[PDB]
Every structure is written in structure tokens, then in C-alpha cells.
């Protein structure tokens, strides 16, 4: 019975789970785009968002500095977290990460995903785009919208 359990059981235990997520998140902060097993990316997405929030909190905040020091195993990224990412997302309030499924791993056919910080310098992902407004169905719905607007 796992009603309401929100954390996956990963690695060799709770500490190993935290460390795996920490390594994935350090890689994400360094490269701005990481491909890893789908479940691990899903688990680490929330922590990525939380680091962005802690970076928004600012350098001077000792609590934020401690959190960044713990989570970023490579200490050169803490200046990055606080001076490149948080300023980038100052305008935003959330949704800093884009996660998208990727063709299964060739080795063990694992469900893989790619997670990136939005607005990174890297080439854009082949994002799935909704159907063009000029399609038949969308044009008919546009006609509906125009008719309703005219009625009101």
C-alpha cells in the first residue's frame, strides 16, 4: 500500500536516492540539458525548480547558500546558480524546466527523458507543436469563436 507516497524508491536507500538526484541535478546545472532515465528525471525536476527558487533567494541568504552548497557537488556551479540561472528566471515564477520523453535507451530499453532549463544557449529541442491554426478543424473552431463574439 503506497497511497500518498510521492517519492520514488531509488538507489540503495534514501541517502542514495538523494545522492543520485544530486548528481543528476549538478549535471543539469552544469550542462543545462541532461538525458537520463525518465523516472529519475521526473524525481529530479522538482529539486531543479527548488534550486532555481533558492538561487532567486539570493547569494547573501545563508540558508540558500547552504542548500546550494549541499546540492551542487561541483562548487563552481554555485556562482552559476546564483548569477546566471536565478537572474535568468527572475521574471518567471515557475516552470523553469522542460522535460520530454526520448526514445528508449538502446542498451536496456529504459524509458529515458531529457530535462533542460528553459532559455539555455543550447540548440532548441524538437518540441512537439500543436496543429496549425490554419487546419480545417481549427478554422472551423475559429468560425465558431467569431460567431460567438459577434453574437456578444
Amino acid at each position: 500500500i503506497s497511497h500518498g507516497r510521492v517519492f520514488r524508491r531509488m538507489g540503495l536507500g534514501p541517502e542514495s536516492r538523494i545522492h543520485l538526484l544530486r548528481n543528476l541535478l549538478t549535471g543539469l546545472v552544469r550542462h543545462e540539458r541532461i538525458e537520463a532515465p525518465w523516472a529519475r528525471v521526473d524525481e529530479m525536476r522538482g529539486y531543479a525548480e527548488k534550486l532555481i527558487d533558492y538561487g532567486k533567494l539570493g547569494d547573501t541568504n545563508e540558508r540558500a547558500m547552504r542548500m546550494a552548497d549541499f546540492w551542487l557537488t561541483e562548487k563552481d556551479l554555485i556562482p552559476k546558480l546564483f548569477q546566471v540561472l536565478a537572474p535568468r528566471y527572475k521574471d518567471q515564477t515557475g516552470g523553469y524546466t522542460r522535460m520530454l520523453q526520448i526514445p528508449n535507451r538502446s542498451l536496456d530499453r529504459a524509458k529515458m527523458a531529457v530535462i533542460e532549463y528553459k532559455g539555455n544557449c543550447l540548440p532548441p529541442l524538437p518540441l512537439p507543436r500543436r496543429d496549425s491554426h490554419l487546419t480545417l478543424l481549427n478554422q472551423l473552431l475559429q468560425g465558431l469563436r467569431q460567431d460567438l463574439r459577434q453574437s456578444q
Binding site: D59, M65, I78, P79
Partner: protein, 48 residues
Amino acid sequence: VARYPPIVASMTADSKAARLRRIERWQATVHAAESVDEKLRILTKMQF
């Protein structure tokens, strides 16, 4: 006012930089050693 942690390699990781940092830890113990006897003992204890 912002106390960034020092940008050094991990002392326990399995990497070239971590190995160099462990070597630096050893050499720091040698430096801290006061007596020349202790210095020589630390410098020569490992037989390779």
C-alpha cells in the same frame, strides 16, 4: 558578504582532481609535522 564555498575538487571522489587533492592532504600532513623525524616517517612510510 557572500561566502561562496571554495572551488576545489572533491577529496573523496574517484577522479584525477580528487586524487591530486588527496595528495595535497598528505603533503599538508607532512608540512604540519613538526619534528624532522615525523616528516621523514610520513614521507617514507609508504613502500612502493
